[PDB]
Design a protein around this motif. Structure first.
Motif, mmCIF file in Angstrom:
data_model
loop_
_atom_site.group_PDB
_atom_site.id
_atom_site.type_symbol
_atom_site.label_atom_id
_atom_site.label_comp_id
_atom_site.label_asym_id
_atom_site.label_seq_id
_atom_site.Cartn_x
_atom_site.Cartn_y
_atom_site.Cartn_z
ATOM 1 N N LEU A 177 0.997 -1.254 0.197
ATOM 2 C CA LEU A 177 -0.218 -0.427 -0.118
ATOM 3 C C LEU A 177 0.588 1.122 0.245
ATOM 4 O O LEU A 177 0.730 2.027 0.656
ATOM 5 N N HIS A 219 -0.105 5.456 -0.649
ATOM 6 C CA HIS A 219 -2.166 5.398 -0.409
ATOM 7 C C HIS A 219 -1.236 5.827 1.112
ATOM 8 O O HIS A 219 -0.916 7.410 1.028
ATOM 9 N N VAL A 225 -11.746 -2.340 8.090
ATOM 10 C CA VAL A 225 -10.430 -2.294 9.594
ATOM 11 C C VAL A 225 -10.967 -3.535 10.458
ATOM 12 O O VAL A 225 -9.737 -4.108 11.588
ATOM 13 N N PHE A 238 -3.682 -11.401 12.266
ATOM 14 C CA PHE A 238 -2.890 -11.158 12.956
ATOM 15 C C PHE A 238 -2.501 -13.001 13.411
ATOM 16 O O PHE A 238 -1.726 -13.148 14.392
ATOM 17 N N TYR A 295 -8.121 -1.802 20.034
ATOM 18 C CA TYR A 295 -7.490 -1.194 19.266
ATOM 19 C C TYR A 295 -8.132 -0.471 18.112
ATOM 20 O O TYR A 295 -7.686 0.179 17.890
ATOM 21 N N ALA A 296 -8.497 -1.536 17.625
ATOM 22 C CA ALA A 296 -9.316 -1.493 16.134
ATOM 23 C C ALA A 296 -9.763 -0.056 15.804
ATOM 24 O O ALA A 296 -9.346 0.403 15.075
ATOM 25 N N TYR A 341 -8.867 3.551 13.759
ATOM 26 C CA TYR A 341 -9.304 4.163 12.906
ATOM 27 C C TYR A 341 -9.679 5.302 12.971
ATOM 28 O O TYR A 341 -10.316 6.248 12.431
ATOM 29 N N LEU A 374 -0.345 -1.586 12.391
ATOM 30 C CA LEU A 374 -1.468 -1.234 11.772
ATOM 31 C C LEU A 374 -2.144 0.464 12.138
ATOM 32 O O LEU A 374 -3.251 0.322 11.467
ATOM 33 N N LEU A 379 -0.810 2.228 10.484
ATOM 34 C CA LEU A 379 -0.540 1.755 7.501
ATOM 35 C C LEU A 379 -2.036 1.706 7.645
ATOM 36 O O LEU A 379 -2.225 2.687 6.410
ATOM 37 N N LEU A 380 -2.469 0.820 8.495
ATOM 38 C CA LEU A 380 -3.735 -0.068 7.318
ATOM 39 C C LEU A 380 -4.622 1.404 7.432
ATOM 40 O O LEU A 380 -5.445 1.746 6.539
ATOM 41 N N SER A 428 -3.993 4.359 5.443
ATOM 42 C CA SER A 428 -4.413 3.535 3.647
ATOM 43 C C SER A 428 -6.144 4.019 3.257
ATOM 44 O O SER A 428 -6.344 3.861 2.311
#
Lengths: 209, 178, 108, 299, 299, 299, 110, 107
Positions: free
Chosen positions: B142, B145, B148, B155, C4-5, C9, C96, C98-99, C102
């Motif tokens: 990515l 860019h 979630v 993981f 955390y997710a 976000y 995570l 960076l996700l 993106s």
């Protein structure tokens, strides 16, 4: 049946009777091997142990009478772990081979065979009280095995007739074998039955030995 | 199930290993397609050299392009790989295959850059693979860019996702001229 | 799932939206009003997201510590334990994030 | 009134044994599908051969030599094993001769057929194989020498890994009382095992004892099953400490001494006081086996 | 009658082994897994070659050399002139064919196989590395004087990492045929071990020993965790070295020799072990190592 | 024969070197880390080009001159690399791998083999921080001229670091034909070592050496810890204490040569104390190189 | 843990103390108001903004600011943790990380 | 190190001496009513805070000012003066990081 007991083992091997140059195996032990293991575990020494080129000359005149079944709980896979095992040559047996003659077993040659990743068995024995008592004395008296008879029931085996096509049956099996010229054992094929209920009376087989 | 394999013409010997995984425990083991390991082991040694030759008949269209949220988890990998390769190739020189296909005498120069930009990433993912280091290479995937709530899978598996990212990356590998 | 997710976000989208509405002083309602204002708004978001994307990669490993750009993007009782959870084993948190960046990256 | 049996573990180190069965230009090692994974294994025959090699090394007499022959591997320098003494140390004395030494007419000894003592299991690794590979230079010997050259030079590759092994004894009975000195020597040889595998001289792996713990009363083995254990942890400790805390009165911890080499460093006093004041000494495997032999001479 | 084996390490510096097995644009070094991390490898063949080279340098009789003048590299003096009467370290090279120097029986009664006196092992790092680390540059072409004409014009990459690594070794005990000067010369060559690498263009990594532990009792290998991480300078078995001689006698310290920078960490417990027998704390590793040669050979 | 090798460091200063060739918006300088910290930069091959250029300005043949006419850099050549007619860039006739063959080995009997006779390694900084910018900018011309550079305006920044860094090297050569003049010129030129990392009109840095130390010039390779002295602090003075100790009582000393900084600001009594052989103490580093070359070269 | 909430506690105390200096300490005049609540948060956000700006500007003076300037203007409180008031002399970085985290949380602006 | 607690401990005795000097009957009257403590607390607050400005003014004379003040109140000063070379040769470590931030900003 009086009562039955459970056992498990991590590794084992059950050779077909004179399989050939390359060995093989069967998913379940033969009935004769199980009978011998139970007889030895009780401490009962072999009835005949004469010596010669061969052994295992067993009449049935003096031998306990008993009925055995067989069971199975969890399927297991197979592997092949070997590269060599010597033999006894057939042919000229020339040069030194004939020179030594010291319990020869010479001319080492490579060969492979199979092993079982895991094994577990559940069946026990229908037997008179005295035999069970002396078996207990042999086990406890003057890998691991223990009786969990009533719970923990699984699939079983039974001889199959020319109908009701089974699944993943055992190709061959042995009932009573002596290492001489004979007719060996009559029935070969066996079929597994899957149900969490007591095995049918057909599963129990009264062993001539 | 076996009647399906003969349909694909000139099956590569790697995708052919699908026959091996045909075997209350192992009834549905084929559905996870855990063929990355042994398929990679043999492909490394003599066929890392030969992978550029004839694409082994497009690798049966790369397993026929996966023969087409867990299904969406498989599909997002296919989308992400294509988006990555297209966006990176564009950001390099701003040349588009839409215009390239319009004019002749310029297809293979585009295709050579496509080859040399896909194989390097494929080899980068080929090695340096373990529980933690692999997820850090997703920065490159990515680089130019809901959506979630799947880290509880990423993981934990770390192998199925790796297998998908490895195999689907070869889908963008160029098709043969003939 | 108070984990955390969604936490990362939420702060990621809140961070980018806040400072673009501060530096550029823009709201999404004005963006959808006309196609013209939308595209430079998309372009302005393009520059905003990428500078953090490249720079967050610039500082790596434990030298990132738990001190980040514009003071950890300036993120009640749940904060106490969550801070301790990210106090140790910080490697996965940065990966995570960076996700999320993106995800905030505009499409097309 | 039995023979005790135990389980040994080895320090981690890169693997050495290449198990043949080579395919294309790679050498491999056999694997087992314990739980759908890969694991390196060693057959008990190699351990038997290595133990007999150490027995001959220590100076104990024997009547069999496996010597490096130029033609093909073979074993020679053996005569009729008429006495159980002076031969093969009361183990592995097969014979299948069809006509030998007038059978027993002049041999006057037991046939020694299908007899064994100290039947041992086979070794298993503790860590899954991760599909490793290390390449290999392998240049041709010469391009001008008189001796051949295989006409070219190749580029091979082999796989190695670092993993410990666990290994059970499975020695029982009471018939092995004729030569207690031989038993003590064999125990010392086990304690002093090195280079058990025939793998290769370079990158050699040696089996040194490391927290060998198991014991039982004159009853058949049960309980811990010698397997089903975690890696680089306290499987010894967790398993038998939990069992003995659950079975302090069910099984006698006095005879079944302590377990684990790590507990020799911390919490030793607490475990000792909570379990028993038995002969649970654990400093080194050598003195441990020394006191095992001391207590075993009387039984 | 007396065995010896030791683990030695060196000083930190960038990596030196380079093979380029991956690709022309990207060069990589061998990688091994360890507890989830990655580490570098130096194969024992490189050390064998380096030892052969130093035996060449130290004015010792030789039976092998290269040519460096062939399209594909090969060896000449190992196979062409020598019937393998006496190798460098009695390695007595082997190769099988339909015949070898008249079946290697009539002209020189030697076995086809070899001796393999030396016992080495793989070399492993102490801390992990991480991915690409350095850029690189390449020219276009010669231009006017066209003789090279590579026409590459690329910007490749290189892999470097900073790590000091250690490795063990062992030696046979009862080998004494023509030993007195041969084995001590080999030991002296080990003492330096300068020119070993997969490439010496810009790395120049020196294998200078820093710390050594090279003694045990006259028996087989005890395997006291040979691969020691050494805590980046320390040693993890000082506790197992204090009881030099006591009532328990749980550890033999009369037979041990300690390297340099272990001593340089000058401490009061070093006083304590001074009067302890078998202290043998020498500041200079090389003179200690020569003294070990003298004691194992002369004494 | 004599073998020498030395280490140097430069004066502290700000610096920055073009090292990315990757991105245009930002510039990166950091290359390799240590013990979890990023404090090392610079390539081990640019100084080769610097030495070549300086040798060009010193009157030795211009065998390979860099030319800048094409977009990608290309370097010309003479008729053929010859280590006899001329210096061959310090006798650097290197590999020529091409399918044409027809090399001078069959015509001029030139095996194309190298004469390296040089050793160098990458430098390492002593300061870890690489997270500062300068924030310069570039304009748009828009002056209606015939050439427009970018037709845009950008706000791009650069990174610099203020650090002093050390440098090891080794020679380990020997005198041969036409060598003494060339090796003397090399030792003369290494003193200045200017123009590193190409042209730099905005950042100006020098490699003028201070506190140069050379080790074990007459003796064989025995040195250790080349990267020793750092943190603007002397470290070889205790090395003399522990390696080849000044007094010839427990560890006989050796011939060393020391630079200027380590003696410019250091205890006066120590100069008199360090007089077992007097070593080699000099004020300016350039002074000692001529004498060292005279002594090692023998003339 | 206990130090983290201590950092939290002093963050509230400093903020309300600044409010007391500028306006009334008690907060009940701004209850259900479209203007009184507006000004109350406005003076709240600007006070923390300038204080946080001064703190994050001294990036490379980590240790010294934690001795001198980052600890005088914020009124700190101590009850018994003299032993834990020691890592301020050797850590000097994570404590700053905690302080910026606490101040960032005390930014009630939507 | 140890002087950190030494400076810590002597400060409570310093402020307790401060309270006992300006105020009368000390803490014995605290149990009377919480009212008088408020004036005692606010006075004890208004004396320390004004001292904050003076103590952090300038390094050179903030020494000279605090020696004379420190020698007056505490009585165990003979122990500390004869030890550690009178605060490690007069001025060191900016007077222990400015008297440990005036005793952590007065608790």
């Amino acid at each position: 049946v009086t009562r039955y007991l459970r056992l498990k083992a991590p590794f084992a091997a059950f050779r077909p009777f004179q399989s050939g140059s390359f060995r093989s195996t069967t998913p379940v032990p033969s009935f004769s091997a199980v009978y011998g293991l139970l007889l030895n575990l009780a401490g009962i020494e072999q009835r005949q142990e004469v010596e010669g080129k061969v052994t295992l000359i067993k009449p049935k005149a003096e031998l306990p009478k008993l009925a055995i079944a067989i069971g199975q709980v969890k399927p297991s896979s197979t592997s092949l772990i070997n590269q060599q095992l010597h033999n006894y040559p057939v042919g000229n047996s020339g040069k030194e081979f004939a020179s030594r003659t010291f319990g020869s077993k010479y001319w080492i040659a490579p060969v492979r065979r199979e092993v079982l990743v895991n094994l577990d068995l559940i069946i026990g024995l229908q037997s008179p009280v005295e035999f069970w008592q002396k078996l207990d004395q042999g086990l406890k008296g003057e890998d691991e095995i223990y009786p969990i008879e009533k719970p923990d029931l699984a699939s079983w085996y039974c001889p199959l007739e020319p109908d009701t096509r089974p699944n993943q049956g055992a190709c061959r099996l042995t009932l009573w074998i002596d290492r001489e010229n004979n007719t060996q054992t009559t029935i070969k094929v066996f079929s597994p039955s899957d149900f969490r209920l007591e095995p049918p009376a057909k599963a129990w087989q009264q062993l001539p030995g | 199930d076996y009647n399906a394999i003969k349909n694909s013409y000139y099956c590569p010997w790697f995708r052919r290993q699908l026959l091996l995984n045909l075997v209350l425990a192992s009834q549905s083991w084929l559905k996870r397609h855990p063929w990355y390991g042994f398929g990679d082991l043999l492909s490394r040694i003599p066929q890392r050299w030969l992978k550029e030759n004839n694409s082994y008949f497009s690798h049966d269209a790369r397993q026929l392009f996966t023969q087409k949220k867990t299904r969406e988890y498989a599909e997002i990998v296919y989308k992400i790989a294509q988006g990555f390769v297209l966006s990176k190739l564009s950001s390099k020189h701003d040349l588009q295959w839409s215009k390239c296909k319009g004019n002749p005498k310029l297809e293979r120069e585009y295709n050579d850059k496509k080859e040399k930009v896909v194989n390097e990433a494929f080899l980068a993912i080929r090695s340096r693979t373990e529980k933690q280091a692999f997820i850090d290479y997703f920065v490159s995937t990515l680089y130019p860019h809901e959506f979630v709530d799947f880290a509880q899978k990423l993981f934990q598996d770390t192998d199925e996702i790796r297998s998908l990212t490895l195999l689907a990356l070869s889908s963008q590998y160029p098709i043969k001229r003939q | 799932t108070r984990e955390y997710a969604e936490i990362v976000y939420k702060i990621a989208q809140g961070f980018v939206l806040s400072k673009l509405s501060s530096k550029h002083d823009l709201q999404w309602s004005k963006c959808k009003g006309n196609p013209k204002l939308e595209r430079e708004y998309n372009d302005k978001k393009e520059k905003v997201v990428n500078e953090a994307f490249l720079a967050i990669r610039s500082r790596t490993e434990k030298q990132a510590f738990i001190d980040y750009f514009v003071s950890t993007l300036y993120p009640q009782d749940e904060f106490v334990d969550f801070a301790q959870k990210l106090f140790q084993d910080t490697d996965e948190i940065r990966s995570l994030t960076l996700l999320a960046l993106s995800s905030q990256y505009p499409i097309k | 009134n039995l023979n005790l049996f135990a389980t040994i573990l080895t320090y981690p180190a890169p693997a050495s044994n290449y198990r043949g069965e080579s395919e294309e230009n790679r050498s491999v090692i056999q694997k087992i599908l314990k739980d759908g994974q890969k694991y390196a294994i060693i057959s008990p025959e190699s351990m038997r051969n290595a133990l007999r090699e150490m027995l001959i090394e220590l100076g104990q007499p024997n009547n069999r030599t496996r010597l490096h022959s130029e033609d093909q591997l073979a074993v020679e320098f053996k005569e009729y094993p008429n006495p159980d003494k002076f031969a093969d140390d009361f183990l592995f004395g097969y014979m299948v001769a069809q006509t030998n030494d007038a059978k027993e007419m002049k041999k006057l000894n037991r046939p020694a057929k299908r007899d064994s003592i100290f039947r041992c299991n086979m070794a298993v690794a503790v860590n899954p194989y991760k599909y490793d590979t290390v390449f290999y230079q392998s240049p041709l010997n010469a391009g001008d020498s008189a001796w051949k050259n295989s006409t070219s030079s190749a580029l091979l590759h082999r796989e190695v890994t670092h993993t410990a092994f666990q290994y059970p004894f499975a020695l029982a009975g009471k018939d092995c009382a004729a030569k207690p000195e031989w038993v003590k020597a064999l125990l010392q040889a086990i304690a002093e095992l090195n280079g058990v595998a025939g793998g290769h001289a370079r990158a050699y792996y040696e089996f040194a004892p490391r927290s060998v713990v198991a014991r039982l009363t004159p009853k058949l083995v049960a309980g811990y099953q010698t397997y089903g254990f975690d890696a680089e942890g306290n499987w010894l400790e967790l398993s038998r400490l939990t069992a003995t805390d659950s079975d302090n009165l069910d099984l006698p911890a006095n005879e079944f001494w302590l377990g684990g080499e790590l507990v020799r460093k911390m919490d030793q006093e607490q475990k000792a006081q909570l379990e028993a004041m038995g002969a649970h000494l654990y400093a080194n495997p050598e003195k441990l086996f020394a006191d095992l032999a001391d207590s075993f001479l009387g039984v």
